[model samples]
Target: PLGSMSQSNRELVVDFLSYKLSQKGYSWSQMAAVKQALREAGDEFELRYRRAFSDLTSQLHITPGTAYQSFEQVVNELFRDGVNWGRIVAFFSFGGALCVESVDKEMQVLVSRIAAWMATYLNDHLEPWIQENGGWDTFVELYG
Candidate 1:
């Protein structure tokens, strides 16, 4: 499956999986399964990025009012090279997973901020890409 993707796309998938694992409250079994799958897939980069982001998030000092602003900066930094459909999907997937795992009001607000950034990114970036890349239907066929 990786063979069929552009290098950028492959990176996005790895980053997405990394973000998924970084969400709080995932079970040990889930982590093991994902780790095994990544290893079997022969992509050490995924695990590396997973660890990197996990550590990065853990170290961030997110306060109640500033959480969204901090996260926006983090997301932009993560995709500084360029954005794409896969990356956008990963961003939202991470936000959704975070929301599901959130145990507090602050966490929920952080997820909401992530969602807001995603919406802005879609409007400013993804929508144009989708239009040029044969519209949403083609995007679904390729990346969905």
Candidate 2:
């Protein structure tokens, strides 16, 4: 555990969820299960906090040209006060919602772009806060 703990909380969380697979046992990696856990956790938050999530997400306006910039602006405001699990979950839901709308509008190109931008924000912006709050392991324990 000590050996892996020192890595960036970004990848650390990935394996944390990967480790969470099956027994979350010591195996190669569990990316599939990791994706499921994060989605489910974020979905639960979106359901319980629908009003706030909808309000915050309403600020988002994604288009093929303006997608990443809009995401950065909205997400920055979302975390302006502080970072927490509920807020983090909302971010994921925001990305997912953007993807859904893109599909609805038939802007299929926007889906992967939204994913890339969200990934950048997660790695560059959210990783430090994630590390500060006991990493994704803590997330799994609390939200798993």
Candidate 3:
């Protein structure tokens, strides 16, 4: 369990949700909810990472505080409409792809090892939320 992939999968969920919610509208309350959810999910992911990998996040040499700060900045920027949701999604997707692709050979081998399951779990978690919203685009129009 030294190198599990739950963190990456959870990160994708939060990232996807943030982007999708941004695309729907720019309401402060909605954005707040999305941001809070993302932060909470990230925290939860960190806890899971600790449990699954038997690793203290700090020991991994990744900056959790900086990560959360960046997430908050993106949430605020998207709320201000300085960031486009589609583009945000594209960028995150690209980064995620690279993480998966370079896992074994690069800095994060856990990602490559669990890439298949990670993808499946991410979709499994997100699709239900999208479905609950009655699909992403349709749900957007319903609120307006």
Candidate 4:
């Protein structure tokens, strides 16, 4: 959300995120703004620490419905504070992070559950707010 997000930051973020989506067989080409927004959101923490990313992500698996409720609480706090590009990005990162962890736990089925949850949230929650904000074109002027 600040300082052009740095081009190298942008590159590696997209690199890692796209790989995650592709691993699940999702098409990144379809949703440019939301896609990029989420990628850019995670870019920093993920940027600062891919090792942390690897370690934490691989270790976060739990009972299906239970874990989502916990994830939602963190997400609820972020949104509760009002939406920002950074928070929106965090939203996406949350989902992708879980998906990666799911595979690591050998519970690939949870990947779809995470995606399903993400899609619903994007459509029902993020999209309305995003549309009002002029979509990702607005996202670029600030984050780009």
Pick by TM-score: 1 or 4, better one: 4
1 versus 2: better lDDT goes to: 2
TM-score of each: 0.47, 0.73, 0.25, 0.60
Pick out the ten consecutive residues of candidate 4 with the lowest summed lDDT: 52-61
Show the lowest summed lDDT stretch of 10 residues, model 2: 24-33
> 1-144 in candidate 1: lDDT tens per residue?
757668878778766766575465242344444444433332333333344454334333444555555666666665677766555544554454455545354466566665676677667656776688776455434532
Q: Which is superior by TM-score, 3 or 4?
A: 4
Which parts of model 2 have CA positions greater than 4 angstroms off?
1-34
Which of the numbered candidates is closest to the native, going by highest TM-score? 2
Top-scoring candidate (lDDT): 2
- Candidate 3: tens digits of C-alpha lDDT, residues 51-103: 44322222223221234334333333333433333323332333344354445
lDDT of each: 0.54, 0.77, 0.43, 0.66
What RMSD, rounded to one decimal, does every model reach? 14.5, 8.6, 16.6, 12.0
**lDDT of prediction 1:** 0.54
Ranking by lDDT: 2, 4, 1, 3
Find the 10 residues in a row with the least total lDDT in model 1. Answer: 38-47
lDDT of 4 by residue, 34-99 (tens): 455456657874676444423423234444654555555556665886887766766677678777
Name the candidate, 2 or 4, with the larger lDDT value.
Answer: 2
Query: In each prediction, how many residue pairs overlap at the backbone (N, C-alpha, C within less than 3 A)?
Result: 0, 3, 0, 0
